[PDB]
UniProtKB/Swiss-Prot annotation:
This is Protein TERMINAL FLOWER 1. It comes from the Eukaryota. CDD domains: PEBP_euk. GO terms for cellular component: cytoplasm; nucleus; plasma membrane; vacuole; vesicle. Controls inflorescence meristem identity and is required for maintenance of an indeterminate inflorescence. Prevents the expression of 'APETALA1' and 'LEAFY'. Also plays a role in the regulation of the time of flowering in the long-day flowering pathway. May form complexes with phosphorylated ligands by interfering with kinases and their effectors. Belongs to the phosphatidylethanolamine-binding protein family. Changing G92S: In tfl1-11; early-flowering and terminal inflorescence. The keyword Cytoplasm applies. It comes from Arabidopsis thaliana (Mouse-ear cress). Signal peptide: none annotated. Mutagenesis of His-82 to Tyr converts the repressor of flowering 'TERMINAL FLOWER 1' into a 'FLOWERING LOCUS T'-like activator of flowering. GO terms for molecular function: transcription coregulator activity. SUPFAM superfamilies: PEBP-like. PROSITE patterns: PBP.
Length: 165
């Protein structure tokens, strides 16, 4: 039931494997929480959001990625995924500003149709801090990225829909 909007919205399937959410994540833009699957205007999301994470060991570290799988349009997404943001080594119970920004936040600018803008959080392996070298934002693969950096399955994910205004 908790992952339901991600399954109906095809995030689980198109971008992520099935997982059991275990960390609470709250993504907010100017204090307005992102609600799974609801539409936002691009102008509302032009600056990076606040991403607070909750619960679990204070010693844990988390990686956040933001991706758009529907590029340039969802019907023929031949550039998928477009990478919007990567923050690693976020201490448990804090927020993205406490991690290492590895890929800077790129404002959502969907070209064709309605795109899903997806935030995914992973727990890092114990005693591991990571610094991914990502040469390009196009043709990004979240599943492959998690395998590369030993990030396991997502522990939380949320997304919004956005289209050109």
């Amino acid at each position: 039931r908790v992952i339901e909007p991600l399954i109906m919205g095809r995030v689980v399937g198109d971008v992520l494997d099935f997982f059991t959410p275990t960390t609470k994540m709250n993504v907010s833009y100017n204090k307005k929480q992102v609600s799974n699957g609801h539409e936002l205007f691009p102008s509302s999301v032009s600056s990076k959001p606040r991403v607070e994470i909750h619960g679990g060991d204070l010693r844990s570290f988390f990686t956040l990625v933001m991706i758009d799988p529907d590029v340039p349009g969802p019907s023929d997404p031949f550039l998928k995924e477009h990478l919007h943001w990567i923050v690693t080594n976020i201490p448990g119970t804090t927020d993205a500003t406490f991690g290492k920004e590895v890929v800077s936040y790129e404002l959502p600018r969907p070209s064709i149709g309605i795109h899903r803008f997806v935030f995914v959080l992973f727990r890092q392996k114990q005693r591991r801090v990571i610094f991914p070298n990502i040469p390009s934002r196009d043709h990004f693969n979240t599943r492959k990225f998690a395998v590369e950096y030993d990030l396991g399955l997502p522990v939380a994910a949320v997304f919004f829909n956005a289209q050109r205004e």
